[PDB]
Each structure stands twice: as C-alpha cells, then as structure tokens.
RNA sequence: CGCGGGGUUGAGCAGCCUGGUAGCUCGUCGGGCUCAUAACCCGAAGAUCGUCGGUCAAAUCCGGCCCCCGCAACCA
RNA sequence: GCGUCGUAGUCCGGAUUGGAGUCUGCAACUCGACUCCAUGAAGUCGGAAUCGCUAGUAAUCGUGGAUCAGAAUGCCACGG
RNA sequence: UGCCUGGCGGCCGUAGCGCGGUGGUCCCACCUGACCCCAUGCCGAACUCAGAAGUGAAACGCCGUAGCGCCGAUGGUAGUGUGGGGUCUCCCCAUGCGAGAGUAGGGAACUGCCAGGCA
RNA sequence: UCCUCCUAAAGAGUAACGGAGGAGCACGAAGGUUGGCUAAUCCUGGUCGGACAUCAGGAGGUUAGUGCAAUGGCAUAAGCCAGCUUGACUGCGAGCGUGACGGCGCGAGCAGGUGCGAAAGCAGGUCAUAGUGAUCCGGUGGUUCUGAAUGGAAGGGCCAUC
C-alpha cells in the first residue's frame, strides 16, 4: 500500500512539521497538483486519490506520485491505560509542507487534466491548487 | 517492555580551551578516539587523553596533510 | 615503487625525531653516490653537508658508491660538524636498511667525534 | 570463567610471590618468567606454584 | 579394499638374532576372512613376526608372499609413539577438519567421536590421558588407514571389561583378516579362529580352530605333564 | 638461493632416437632415454595428419565397381 | 643456458626490424615463470599436497611454496589457513633453462599433440597453459606417483600489447596454430 | 494477547539436552508361502526436522513470521 | 601325451558397441544368419522359498531330423 | 645572477587525476654480475653488495591544453538572540546576527636551507 | 548492577513501565620492542575447477580488518607477517578530570634493576570505553612491631593473598 519495505527502525518520534517544501516545481510532466496547506497524508489517501485521477483519464498519460509516506504512525489499543510502552505501528504518513507537488501528469489536454486533479483534490485533507510547468 | 537501560555519562569533551594558561600535567581533552592528535608539548594517555607536558598556552591547530586537528602548547 | 614505498617506511622515525626536537643526520644512498647532511630542529635550514658528488672528496676514491666511499663521506661529515659547534646528533635511517654502506657511513662518524 | 588464580612463587628462597590467572586446561605446562624480587632487589626467575 | 584368495602365505621362514633362533622352518597360509590368535611365552618372537610381515625386518630363510589385494595396517606394541604436547583431536586427525577413513572422508570430529571421545573430552592433551584412554586414542589414530589385514599387537593393553567387550564384539564383524597377538586367552576364546602356538627350540605350530578344539586336539593326542610350579622365592 | 633445501641441479644429458644429445640442466642424476623429440616434433605433423574426417561419397563410389 | 643467448642475439635484432622501436630496450622481455598446482583435494589428507610438492620439486629445481586459502568460502568447504595449492617461481638464467627444456622435451611428449592456442593472451602479452599430466616431464617413472594430476604454466612478459607479445613467443619457435 | 507449550517420514512418537552420528512401531511398494485372501517370511523406498533469517559446526542457539494447544481476566 | 598360465575380475567371462564383410532372397532400415578386426560390461556360487532324479538312471559331451529360400539356446531322437 | 637536478622542509587538490609533447654532459632509474656479510615461510621480484657498455622504453621531472576532481562570490532564501502581535499543533512586525545549495566566475600551484651540471 | 547509541535543545549534566543493542570474559601470547608488509570487490587468461578455492596482470582505493554490542578512532597504521623476549617490574609521584561521600580515572618525572634496538628511543599489559561486590568474620605465606611478674609461647598488629 505504497509503503516502505525493510526499513531500518520500526518506530519513530512524533517530530514537528514546520518549514516549507523543496519539490515545488513541475519536473516530469506538464501539469501538477501543489499543496497550499500544511498537514499530512496517509497511505490510504494517496491510493484513494490516485484511483480517482486514473478513472478520469482512464487510458492516457503517465502519472507521477512525487510523495511517499515512509513514516510510521502508531496507536495504542482501545481501553488501555497510559504508559506501558509505545504503541504499535498502524499506518504510514507523508508530512506535507506548503508548496510540495503531490501528483503530476503528462500527455493530457488541459481541460481534462484540470478536472482530473479536482476529483482527486476532494479526497485529500489539505487545500490543493493547480500548477503548470514553467521553463524558468 | 524489553528495553529501558542505559549507561552512566562518561563526561568527555574539551576541558581547557584556547588561550588558557595551564600547569604541567593538566588534562586538556578527555577523548574516545583521537579526534585531537598530540602536538608538541602535549602527551597522549592510554585512554587517549591529551595532557599538558609544560605550562603555557593551549593552541589548537589544523596542521597536516589530512587536515587533522592538533593541540600544542605555546611556551610562555 | 622504490621511493614511494621507502618514504612511507621512514615517516614514523622521521616524525618521532621531529617531536623530540633533535638535530638529525640524514643519509641518502644511491647506486652511484651517497649523501649525508645535518639539519636543524627547524627542519628547514641545514648546517653541514657532505656528498660523493662533491669533487674533492670523490677525487681520492676509485669508484664512488661502495663501502669505502661512504666511510670517507661518513668521516667527512663528522669533520665539518665538530667545527660548527655540533657534537650531539641522532642518526636517521631514512628508509634504507642499516646493514651496508650506511652502517659504514655512520660508524666512521661515530668514531670521528659524534656522540650517538 | 575457566581461568583460575595461580601464584608465581619466587626462586631466591624468600617469601615473595606474584599472582595471576592461568588456563589450567589448555596450558598444562607450568609457567616460569623473570620478575623483580623487591626483597633481594634483583631480577630472578619466578616459578609456578599453587 | 576387497581381498582375494592370497592372504600372505609364508614359506620356510627362519629367524635368528646372532645365534638365538626364534623361529625355524615355518610354513603356513592364512585363509580368507579369518582371525588368528598368537600365543606363547615372553620374548618368543611374536612381535618379530609382525615386524617381518610389515616389512621392517627380513627373513633369514624362506619368503613371506603377500597377496596383491592385501592392505596392511599393523598396530605397534607400544603406546610410546604419540607426542604428549598435542591435543587428542589434533593428534588423531592431523589438524584437518575433514580427514578420510578408507575411501569415504567423513568429518574428523565425528570420526573421533565414534571412539567415545566427546567434544569436551576432545581438548585434553594426549600426555594428560589415562592408560585406557591412551590405548583407545592410539588405536583410533592407527586404525584410520582403512586396511584389511589388521595386525593387532595386544590391543587389550589397559582395557576395562566393557571397553574390551566393545572391541571384542566389533572384531567378530570384520570383513578383512585379523591377526591378533595377546596373552589373555579369555579374550581370544571368543574371537580366535586360527591358533599360532609357540613352543621351545623355536618351534611354531599352526592350528585351525578355537581353543576348545585345540584342547580337543591335545586330549586326542595327549601327554601326561603337569608339574609347572616350583616357587623359587627371593631371600635365603 | 637458500641452499640445502632443494633437490640437486645438474647438466645431465639424455639421448633420443634421432640423436638429440643435449646437456639439459635437470634434476635426475641418472638419465632416462627418450622417444621422439624436437627434431621429430609433431608440430608440423600432428595437425597435418589430423585432417582425415569428412568425405564419404568417394568411399561409396568405389563400391560402384560394377 | 641456451635460449638466453638466443634471445640476446637473434630475437632482439629481428624484432627491431619487425616492430621498429626507436630504442633497443623497448623490445618486450619475458621475465618470470610461475608454476602452480592447485590441489584442493588435500583438504581430506595432507600427504597429497606433499606428493604434489615433491612433483613440482622434481619438475623445477626448487622447493615449492604452498599457498593457503585467501578467503573462507563455504561453497568449496574451505577456509583461510588451509594449504590448498603449491607454487614455484623461476627468474633469470635458471628460468631460461626450464623454459628451454619445456619446448625441447615436454611439448612434443603431449598426448595427441597438435599445437598451442594463440588466442590465450590476457591482452597484455602474458601466456598460460595447463598440461593435465605431469608425465610429459621425463622425471616420473610410475613408481612414486599416485595420480596423474597436472600443472599450470604462466609466462609473464613486459609486452604492453598482445600483438607485441605475439612475436615474443613466436620468435622462439613455439607450436602455435 | 497478557503469559506459557508445540510444529520431525504417509499416521503416532523419539532424538532439541547443550552441536559434529535421521531413528522407532504401523503403514506404501516388490517378491515368497496359499485354491484365493488375511496373517506370517524376505527385500526396498521416502523427511527443505513449520518458516524468514542470522554459530568451524544445529533438528538442537537466538530473534522474527505462520498456525495450533492451554492458562488468567481479582477487589469494588 | 607333451607345454604355458600360478589365483588375478586373470590368458576367466563374451554382453554391448564401431568398422570390414559372405550368403539366401524381388528385396536383410524398422527385422536374418554366419565370418574377421577392435571393444571386453554385469558376474568371485547367489534372501525368503523352491525343482528333478533309485542304474546305464542323475551329471556332462558331441551328432542327427522334422518345420524350412534363409532363419534353434526350443522340440523330437542317437550314441560316449 | 640565469636556467636544470638531488636531498630536507613550509602549507595540504586554485596544489590532485586525465590527455599531448619532451630529458640524459652532470644528476637520476631501469640495467651488468653476484661465490662475498646480507636476503627469499620458492624466486637477486624485494632487501644487499661489486660496477659500468646501452638505455631515456616504463617511472621521475618539466612545460601545454579546461574531460574531471577542486575553489567560489553579490543578491535572495531558510534559521535564530531580544521586544511586541496574531485566525496561535503555525506564523507576522522592530532590531541584531545570517547560512546550506545553486549562478557568474577562478582554476595546470606558490615558497626557504643547502649541495651539484652548465652558460 | 555495568557498557554503546538516540531522546539531550552545537561545553558538561539531564526523566518516563521512552526507541534500539550488549556484559558477569579471553590472552603467557592476542603483551614489549626491532625489522618487514598493506585490504573488500570486479574483469581478462589458465589442468581437473564451476557463480565462488590456487596462479598471472589490470581497474580499484579501505566498500577490508580489529578476540567478543555500538559509538569514536586507526596508513607513522591501533590491521597483517617473523626474531629475540617478560616493563602483564618494585617504591614514589609534580599536576589534573569526575563524584554528596565511599571511591574511580589520566599522569610527565625521580630511584633500583630489566628487555628490545647500531643508536635516538620505547616498554609500569591488550585501539579506548563493560567483563563486577564495601565492612565484619575466618584461612595461608613473610615480619621477634607487640608479648599482662621475667624469659618463651598463644593471640594480636603490618605486608602479600584467598
Ligand atoms: Mg564387479
Ligand atoms: Mg578367484
Ligand atoms: Mg534337414
Ligand atoms: Mg532351415
Ligand atoms: Mg546544551
Ligand atoms: Mg551535550
Ligand atoms: Mg592486540
Ligand atoms: Mg613497526
Ligand atoms: Mg601491537
Ligand atoms: Mg577491545
Ligand atoms: Mg610474659
Ligand atoms: Mg601474625
Ligand atoms: Na613383543
Ligand atoms: Na593409569
């Protein structure tokens, strides 16, 4: 489920999520989906959104997923007192800072690409926008 | 819960800094490897500790073909 | 290589002597000549220099580059050194094995007024 | 642990001995070394003992 | 190796040391698949026979004729051929993790373990060994040639009852030929099929059978003589 | 050389059927006579007589002596 | 030796006109012969290695140096410090002597011999070949040999190219295809 | 899942015991005896020792994965 | 009767395979017999069990015939 | 004074790799021989000794060139000490410090004690 | 109870039933000097021999190794190979580091003898950091220090050690 195989450590600290993003430019295709807000994306949501874009185009153009969770989030069981160790790993998440480009496509006309991403933006917690590749 | 053990801190680091007047035999750095190599007028113990060999001033230098830090004592 | 594997063979002794800060008498042997000089604890400026390429010392020797030549140089460097106020030195192997015409060189210097 | 304590008695006849640990299994041969004897003030040979 | 009909016959053998004759005009032929017990007094040539069989000596007369299929493996009469400054495993194998017995190899550790030398008792130096353990180890080291004409010279040196019976039951199953020299006739009573009896003047006589059948031979051609002891004593 | 840890080296001589008497430096001490040698060397012969495989129609045509 | 003077007199003069170097000593020279017998089977018993060592001592007038395993590998059930091969090195005049007697009285003795493959060059003028039987050397009389284990011979030359090294072994009348 | 135990020929079991050495009884297959079958006699075959893996050396140690079998869930 | 081999997988064994062939036959590929040269394998007396034979018999040796263009280690007979 | 060479340093890639050309009067390596002290877990390959005919072939040293390695601004950005403010799991304003990466661009080292050729 | 890393906020220290691993040893050589040497991996050629054993030469440049976890180190090697060896010495110790204390650690140099080296020099254990247990009571060696009227002795004391 778009999840790392054979990591180095099973459990990780909570950390923080300040700062900005680095992969802010369209690099593989011509259209991309930025990330206006700051949050985090589950592995379930990445696949749920990808299935939404694919069913829109349904034959044409590559899709790149520039983001990858590789961070384990743990949960304590139901009706369990505090302490007694750290919780067990449940799902994997990908922290998102503003500007990060999540998905991006190629070979699709603009109008179809515009609505393909919108059907995916409805599945993601964070506010997202549309960006076109620039020569720079 | 399986883990939960640790060792007492060994209190390493630099004990006298640059421009500090030392007496003979005083410890300059407590070391694990050799991050600081023994320059002139300093020694090197079995614990890789760098002790002064003459009273003076501590001077850190970066002499060497591999840019390895050296500590030497100016005679004053 | 000859020189590449020899300079690394003499680095340890050359650095330890530098730490002690003593004047060292270094020998450089060649299949045709041999050299010996004394260099201050500075490591840069020299005091006494004798070699077989020098014309006067090599005139009296049949073939410069044997045991006989080196002892003539080994005695010769001692001659100059004692006239420069120098008595105590530390012989430096410089990589060459202390067996042949370097043993001959230093031994004559040892018997000609150098205390090492 | 298989190393057991042994003592190196002296050989000058005085009462003086060092102590050490020796593998009596893989080294059945007895030890003898040259150590300092501070009673007679000399380097004498120290033989193995109980 | 498989062995055929010729089992090193011996013809007109005569041995002497100066003038002291041990054996004169001896001739026999060991059959195939047999065990031959040798009996006689002390210093009557029993070890000398194995010596000349194994090529160490030469016969003053006659010739011993080996079979070409015969593999030789002779056990020395004395344990004093090991080096006391070596471990058991090293002494037997030769410092090899895998050695070979006969033709197939199998690991050295297992080969020694087959002689009841467990992994712990593996580590003792052969100088630190009881008499029976030393005998067992020497036998184990020498029996690795994988031969088939086993010339045992008193394997019952320092063997307990159970140690003795283990080899006593293992020998009866031997395919090859076994020549055994011993003094305790009770051990041979269970394994011997041919008999070599020594006598006076250097007389060696062959016989086919066990000791009860030897007694039967004596009783069939008997002689009245039982006055063995005289009790010389020591002090006047 | 390190001396006295080697078999003895000499200049022994052997002889072949085509003469071939050469004082070859070898460690034997009692020479062994030899078969054909470099003067009968099968380097101009062996490959030239190798080629005998292939060609059987001419083998059959001889049977048509009828 | 014999072929040393041959190299001094004929080979260099021929090669100067052949490949046309501007200096005499730019001509390739063959400098060492290394003979190795990799037993491997000596894992079971040591005596085999000593027999192979005596064999090489017979072929070349030197005591072989036995070589142990460089790496512990489980594929062949060996580990470091296990004597696994034997080796001999020949330099100078006594190298020339063995090299001469090789092409004199051992190559023709090869069973069903036709020649030596010419494309057996590692790209820098170094040659090697296995014999598969020690009996090509006349110092074995089927009296002490238990097996017919062979040997590998290597010839190391200063030829910077295999084309340069061609007319090195060719000039000595080697049996090439 | 909080705690323990187990996994070996087709079936049931040893051998884990401190590593160098895979066995047992039944059963499968082929002959024999018998009019024929059972019984009986003779001769064979086969097991990645659950799995991922990490001690010269393991079935044997250790960690994990899988499945199964028990035990405890008390005071209010 | 005179020789050799001296107990070995052999001067035992004669399978299998490669060449050369002779015949009968309209025709020897699937599928004949015989000859020559080379090759020279299992096999060192056989588990459970089981068969024949009471005198010219058992055991061993050779010859013959029927069938048939050719094709017997089988069958039917004969003697030592 | 100038050019060239050997030894000992200074500082450690702006100094090291790659490719092209090039040197043997002296210096330098290869080379010649090795019974001699010396050496080879075999070997004059290495270490070592006795020499001089050829050699500048490989290395070494010189120059030459931007395929590399390497160095690298200005501006901006991230961050952060102190004081305030917000919709406050994050930020903004005043002030002080201010990177890393990347762009331009720089880049075939500089140097002091001796001895030895030469002119 | 002890050792290594992170949490730990660029000196030191810093908690939780926070996240991950080890120790209760070994070595008379695996210690001391004096000489010498330098790895993993890949390619080409080569007798059995292959994906991988030994040999040769090229790329390679520490991805190697450390007596055993991890971190910091290591080419002058602290890694690898031999000779002779016992400094794995006795009495001290300027001066420092770290502890609430008990204690623990580093140490040039001095004296007496010692090994290695031609010497200059190095050596008071092991590349370092775990491999541990106070006091009381008792055991075994040395020492007339003491010895309950005196001379001895028992028993104490001091040094070494269990
Ligand atoms: Mg057979
Ligand atoms: Mg037979
Ligand atoms: Mg008829
Ligand atoms: Mg017919
Ligand atoms: Mg801090
Ligand atoms: Mg800190
Ligand atoms: Mg060590
Ligand atoms: Mg050293
Ligand atoms: Mg060391
Ligand atoms: Mg350590
Ligand atoms: Mg009293
Ligand atoms: Mg007392
Ligand atoms: Na006897
Ligand atoms: Na006893």
Automatic annotation (TrEMBL), chain G:
Protein family (similarity comment): Belongs to the universal ribosomal protein uL5 family.
Source organism, top-level taxon: Bacteria
GO molecular function: rRNA binding; structural constituent of ribosome; tRNA binding
Family matches, as NCBIfam families: PRK00010.1 (NF000585)
Annotated ranges, domain Large ribosomal subunit protein uL5 C-terminal: 83-176
UniProt entry tagged with the keyword Glycosyltransferase: no
This protein's GO CC annotations: ribonucleoprotein complex; ribosome
Subunit structure: Part of the 50S ribosomal subunit; part of the 5S rRNA/L5/L18/L25 subcomplex. Contacts the 5S rRNA and the P site tRNA. Forms a bridge to the 30S subunit in the 70S ribosome.
One Pfam entry name: Ribosomal_L5
Protein name per its UniProtKB record: Large ribosomal subunit protein uL5
Gene: rplE
InterPro entries registered for this protein in UniProt: Ribosomal_uL5, Ribosomal_uL5_bac-type, Ribosomal_uL5_C, Ribosomal_uL5_CS, Ribosomal_uL5_dom_sf, Ribosomal_uL5_N
